[PDB]
Amino acid sequence: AVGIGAVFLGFLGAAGSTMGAASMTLTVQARLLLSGGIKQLQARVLAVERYLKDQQLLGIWGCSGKLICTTAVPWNTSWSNKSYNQIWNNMTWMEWEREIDNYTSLIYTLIEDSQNQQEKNEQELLELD
């Protein structure tokens, strides 16, 4: 005896939209990632153990607690032959994470040890004055 239409957004609702329209939608996929006869308990740890990993990798990159952030790691045009405005206006995310799937390991090493490791030895030694 209830019912009204959509108001804000849905779960995975932007997953056929462009990047410029999905970038304002990230919180709904951010909230419900964690909450949602032993075999319930074996699920209730894997859902935790996946959440910590994605939380941990943001922590190392100097980017914990923010939803988005930027670094100083330069984008390498060898990774993408796509033009700029095609990416931010035409390609969806689900397609996009089949295209840079191979380069992903190179990316994550080239964030930490490249910059945010280096932005602490530089950071700690800006004292003495």
Partner: peptide, 16 residues
């Protein structure tokens, strides 16, 4: 007041 289920941005008006 209307309810706003979390999983889909859609309010709900109860009627009895």
């Amino acid at each position: 007041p209307p309810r706003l289920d979390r999983w889909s941005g859609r309010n709900y008006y109860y009627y009895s």
